[PDB]
Amino acid sequence: NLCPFGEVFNATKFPSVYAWERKKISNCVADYSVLYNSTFFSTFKCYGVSATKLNDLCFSNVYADSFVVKGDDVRQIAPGQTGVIADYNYKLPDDFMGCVLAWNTRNIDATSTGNYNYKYRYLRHGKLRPFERDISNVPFSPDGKPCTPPALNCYWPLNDYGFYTTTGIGYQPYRVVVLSFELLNAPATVC
Amino acid sequence: QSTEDLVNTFLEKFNYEAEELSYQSSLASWDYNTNISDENVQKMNNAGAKWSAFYEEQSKLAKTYPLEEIQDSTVKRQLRALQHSGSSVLSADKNQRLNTILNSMSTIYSTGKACNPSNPQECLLLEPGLDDIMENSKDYNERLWAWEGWRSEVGKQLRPLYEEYVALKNEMARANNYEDYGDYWRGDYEEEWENGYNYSRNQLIDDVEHTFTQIMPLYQHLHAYVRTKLMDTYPSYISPTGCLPAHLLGDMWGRFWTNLYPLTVPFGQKPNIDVTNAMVNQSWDARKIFKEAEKFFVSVGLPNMTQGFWENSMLTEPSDSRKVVCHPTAWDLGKGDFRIKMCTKVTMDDFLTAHHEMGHIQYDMAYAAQPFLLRNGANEGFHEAVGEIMSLSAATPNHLKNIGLLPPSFFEDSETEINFLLKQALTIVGTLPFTYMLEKWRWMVFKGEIPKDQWMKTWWEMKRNIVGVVEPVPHDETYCDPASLFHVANDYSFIRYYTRTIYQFQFQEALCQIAKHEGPLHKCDISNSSEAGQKLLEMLKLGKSKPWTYALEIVVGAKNMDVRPLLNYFEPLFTWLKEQNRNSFVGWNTDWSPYA
Ligand SMILES: [Zn+2]
Numbered sequence: 001n002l003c004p005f006g007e008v009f010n011a012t013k014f015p016s017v018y019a020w021e022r023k024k025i026s027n028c029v030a031d032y033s034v035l036y037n038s039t040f041f042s043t044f045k046c047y048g049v050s051a052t053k054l055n056d057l058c059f060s061n062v063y064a065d066s067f068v069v070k071g072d073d074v075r076q077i078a079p080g081q082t083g084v085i086a087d088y089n090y091k092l093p094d095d096f097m098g099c100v101l102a103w104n105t106r107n108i109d110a111t112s113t114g115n116y117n118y119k120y121r122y123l124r125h126g127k128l129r130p131f132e133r134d135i136s137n138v139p140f141s142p143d144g145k146p147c148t149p150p151a152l153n154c155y156w157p158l159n160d161y162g163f164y165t166t167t168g169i170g171y172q173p174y175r176v177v178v179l180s181f182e183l184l185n186a187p188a189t190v191c
Numbered sequence: 192q193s194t195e196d197l198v199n200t201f202l203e204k205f206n207y208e209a210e211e212l213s214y215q216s217s218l219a220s221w222d223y224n225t226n227i228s229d230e231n232v233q234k235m236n237n238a239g240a241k242w243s244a245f246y247e248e249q250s251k252l253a254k255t256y257p258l259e260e261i262q263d264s265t266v267k268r269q270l271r272a273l274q275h276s277g278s279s280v281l282s283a284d285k286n287q288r289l290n291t292i293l294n295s296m297s298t299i300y301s302t303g304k305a306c307n308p309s310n311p312q313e314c315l316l317l318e319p320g321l322d323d324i325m326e327n328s329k330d331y332n333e334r335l336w337a338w339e340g341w342r343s344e345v346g347k348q349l350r351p352l353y354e355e356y357v358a359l360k361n362e363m364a365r366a367n368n369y370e371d372y373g374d375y376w377r378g379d380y381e382e383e384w385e386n387g388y389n390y391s392r393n394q395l396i397d398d399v400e401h402t403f404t405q406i407m408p409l410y411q412h413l414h415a416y417v418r419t420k421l422m423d424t425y426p427s428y429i430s431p432t433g434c435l436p437a438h439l440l441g442d443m444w445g446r447f448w449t450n451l452y453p454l455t456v457p458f459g460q461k462p463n464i465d466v467t468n469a470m471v472n473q474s475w476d477a478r479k480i481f482k483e484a485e486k487f488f489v490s491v492g493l494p495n496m497t498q499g500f501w502e503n504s505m506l507t508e509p510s511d512s513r514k515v516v517c518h519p520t521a522w523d524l525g526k527g528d529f530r531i532k533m534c535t536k537v538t539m540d541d542f543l544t545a546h547h548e549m550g551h552i553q554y555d556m557a558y559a560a561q562p563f564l565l566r567n568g569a570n571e572g573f574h575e576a577v578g579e580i581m582s583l584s585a586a587t588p589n590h591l592k593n594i595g596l597l598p599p600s601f602f603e604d605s606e607t608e609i610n611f612l613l614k615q616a617l618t619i620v621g622t623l624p625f626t627y628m629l630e631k632w633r634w635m636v637f638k639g640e641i642p643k644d645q646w647m648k649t650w651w652e653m654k655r656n657i658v659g660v661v662e663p664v665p666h667d668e669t670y671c672d673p674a675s676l677f678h679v680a681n682d683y684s685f686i687r688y689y690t691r692t693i694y695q696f697q698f699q700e701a702l703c704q705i706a707k708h709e710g711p712l713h714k715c716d717i718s719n720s721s722e723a724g725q726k727l728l729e730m731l732k733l734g735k736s737k738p739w740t741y742a743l744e745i746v747v748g749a750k751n752m753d754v755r756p757l758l759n760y761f762e763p764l765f766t767w768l769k770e771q772n773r774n775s776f777v778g779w780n781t782d783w784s785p786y787a
Contacts, residue, residue, distance in 0.1 A: 122204075123200075142192035142197070142200065143192055152252075152255075153197055153200070153201075155200070159207055162211055164214070164526065166218070166499075166503065166524070166526075166528050167526045167527050167528060168497070168526065168527020168528060169498070169499075169527070170527060171526050171527045
């Protein structure tokens with residue numbers, strides 16, 4: 001039943017935050033020992049659990065969420081802490097938490113000319129509800145009646161992140177995986 | 192959607208776009224400065240153009256949004272900055288004509304050459320020749336040729352352009368609703384806040400006058416002392432009572448009295464301390480010098496330098512092919528990137544320079560949290576002043592003794608202290624009268640108080656009255672002496688320099704009080720005091736969010752400019768000066784002319 005967690009842990013491409021990928025890994029066993037040992041993660045925090053007991057704990061229907069955010073945005077991914085990207089791009093239920101892993105990956109994701117591939121949504125009507133994905137690209141306007149191109153007060157809702165090699169650490173790209181653990185929804189897929 | 196809701200969303204996106212393009216332009220500029228090549232110029236130009244174009248469109252969009260409607264001060268300040276749009280109002284061909292005038296004057300100043308009367312073949316460009324001659328020469332004849340030559344070639348050519356220069360500037364100002372170009376210039380100091388932090392352009396002029404009257408005695412005593420010292424080198428030329436001749440001051444425009452120091456040293460035998468060879472004995476290196484400067488900041492409690500800065504910054508002159516700009520500069524590229532570009536040689540002066548540059552970088556770090564529009568020093572003067580005080584404390588002997596470059600045995604004596612103070616006075620006290628009069632004349636010309644036919648006449652009369660400086664040879668209306676100075680030619684205000692000097696001394700006095708130093712102000716060192724650093728930090732953090740009056744109040748307890756700390760710093764020197772000048776006459780007579 002043990003299956004490597006390495007391949008989603010490491011991939012050629014991780015998606016943008018607005019289109020956060022959700023991965024269902026169930027019936028895949030991870031020792032969790034390497035989690036504690038490796039310092040590959042600049043920040044490792046499990047709000048939901050102490051994690052001392054993670055290895056013994058049986059896991060049911062675990063979820064992996066993978067996205068790229070800049071370093072400043074990493075703290076926003078926490079209980080509460082709504083800010084902007086938690087509010088509009090990825091929402092974490094306050095009650096339910098698992099373990100959050102964040103590592104700098106400046107050399108792979110940034111270059112001198114810059115990488116503009118990653119995207120974030122800065123304008124939205126309403127607030128994201130927990131674990132909900134909005135993929136739509138509406139023209140946008142606080143008055144409704146969206147005007148597609150140059151009219152006053154109408155703007156596109158998506159902005160490129162623009163990572164660069166020369167930038168400071170907060171600006172530098174961070175790849176973050178959030179694993180979410182559903183407790184006892186079904187008999188534990190992982191034991 | 193309410194008025195400010197529309198305003199905030201607009202400001203919201205303006206900021207995002209601006210950050211990216213500003214960074215690209217900054218990177219191009221850095222590349223050109225580090226390596227000088229023609230396509231680096233080309234790339235630099237392209238990036239700059241796009242940034243400027245983007246700004247103009249945003250400014251136009253901003254202006255069609257009522258400002259009074261906004262009820263939040265933070266938002267209003269940001270909209271206000273975008274809305275200024277000063278030159279947009281003027282007509283396009285009026286626009287074009289003005290641009291041509293400006294380009295022409297800059298070129299004339301740069302390429303101007305003055306040829307020796309005695310040798311027709313010898314012709315000297317100002318940048319690598321004329322200044323050197325004025326700096327080193329002790330011959331009256333030689334100094335005179337240089338002064339007159341620059342005066343005659345550049346000034347006469349510049350004057351027709353200058354007059355057209357003035358008229359159009361005034362026109363755009365009135366289109367923008369300012370009374371004249373002068374208050375267009377005076378606008379930056381002006382601030383509006385509800386509970387008595389209000390400042391107005393009218394008030395600034397009055398404040399300058401009051402400060403000037405107070406520092407007047409100290410200047411006259413210095414003038415008398417300089418009078419006697421130069422009498423020894425030029426006995427026939429200067430009649431005591433009379434004002435000093437313009438050419439002999441040591442600078443072409445007479446801005447600084449620094450080079451007069453070898454002639455004027457109070458005590459020849461005692462030497463000013465220099466730790467350069469000590470650094471050589473201890474094998475100090477450029478990286479070493481920078482590391483020590485960082486340590487000084489850490490002990491006062493301000494944050495240590497970033498990981499990245501050390502790697503990307505050019506701390507040494509590049510070897511071989513790369514061509515570099517010599518001047519030391521501090522760069523805030525943006526996006527968390529801070530760099531210092533300088534060529535460092537092991538010298539005492541460089542140790543001091545490193546501290547000053549570091550100070551500028553620290554403030555840049557402090558205001559980063561503030562919004563893109565508000566990411567700046569509160570006023571023109573504040574940024575320079577913050578860098579300056581750090582250098583002063585580094586320069587004190589106790590700090591050097593702690594470093595170990597200065598031996599423990601060394602004891603400072605009264606004679607050295609007087610020598611140090613006079614050197615400082617020549618640079619600081621001497622500059623203020625010149626700065627005041629220059630701005631004085633320009634403002635009057637812009638409003639039209641002075642008629643064009645009397646422009647030169649008034650300028651020279653003012654020099655005699657305020658700075659005690661008399662022209663060596665009489666000058667016709669065709670000559671344009673103010674235009675010869677670089678700032679006037681390139682349209683730069685000089686009001687900033689006067690204000691900065693007052694601010695720096697106030698900051699130092701307050702910080703020393705927190706540190707509880709007992710003794711003379713010149714002796715005080717702020718090193719190893721956490722508390723002094725902390726309060727400085729609070730002022731640095733606010734940036735431009737709140738007014739300049741409020742910021743000054745936070746550190747020193749006073750809303751307005753106060754000249755008293757400056758006087759306290761120079762008080763020991765003043766008593767000594769008074770005793771020397773007790774016998775000789777104090778003051779000057781405007782009537783005396785070298786030409787007579
Ligand atoms: Zn500076």
